[PDB]
């Protein structure tokens, strides 16, 4: 049905400290579907290319964006920049961006994202809130 009009399916935004979080998200989303693919920075960034250009292309060439918020996310400038870029690409809360808190209380939530819903991390696993359902529904409405 020519569902494949974009490069990849899911993009993950994470703080530079917890690589394991984004790796777990990709290895939890790709395994159970066998059709859905994904992009991760360290796993798929082309060596020898600019960080800014690679991240911009990664966020642009995906169907869904996933943001990982960490107590290290607030301090590190790079993940803040990538969050700003992800918001810029899809300012409307259609469903492209999926926040995922881990360790931050509701009060400490970044003020820039107080308007959209957030996938709370209080579940034993974040994926227990089934973000794959969200990405699958967005893809279904897309095509």
By CB under 8 A, name the binding residues for its own copies.
42, 45-54, 56-57, 60, 77-78, 80-81, 84-85, 87-99, 111-112, 114-119, 129, 131, 134, 137
In whole angstroms, what is the distance from residue 91 CA to residue 2 CA? 27
Question: 37 near 8, Cβ under 8 Å?
Answer: yes
CB of 119 to its own copies, least distance (A): 5
In the bound state with its own copies, the residue whose beta carbon lies nearer, of 27 and 84, is: 84
Helix (H) or strand (E) holding 29: helix 19-29
CB of 131 to its own copies, least distance (A): 6
Q: How far is CA 135 from CA 83, 101, 128, 130, 142, in A?
A: 18, 17, 14, 9, 10
CB of 113 to its own copies, least distance (A): 8
CB of 31 to its own copies, least distance (A): 20
In the bound state with its own copies, the residue whose beta carbon lies nearer, of 37 and 80, is: 80
Q: What is the DSSP letter of 106?
A: S
Cα-Cα-Cα-Cα torsion 33, 39, 41, 42, nearest 10 degrees, comes to 50
């Amino acid at each position: 049905s020519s569902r494949w009009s974009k490069d990849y399916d899911v993009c993950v935004c994470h703080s530079e400290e917890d690589l394991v979080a984004a790796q777990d998200l990709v290895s939890y989303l790709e395994g159970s579907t066998a059709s859905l693919r994904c992009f991760l920075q360290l796993r798929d960034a082309t060596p020898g290319g600019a960080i800014v250009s690679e991240l911009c292309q990664a966020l642009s060439s995906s169907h869904c964006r996933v943001l990982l918020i960490t107590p290290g996310f607030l301090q590190d400038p790079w993940c803040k920049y990538q969050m700003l870029q992800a918001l810029t690409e899809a300012p409307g809360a259609e469903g492209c961006t999926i926040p995922l808190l881990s360790g931050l209380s509701r009060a400490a939530y970044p003020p820039e994202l107080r308007f959209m819903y957030y996938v709370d991390g209080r579940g034993p696993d974040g994926g227990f809130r089934q973000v794959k359902e969200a990405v699958m529904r967005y893809l279904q409405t897309l095509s």
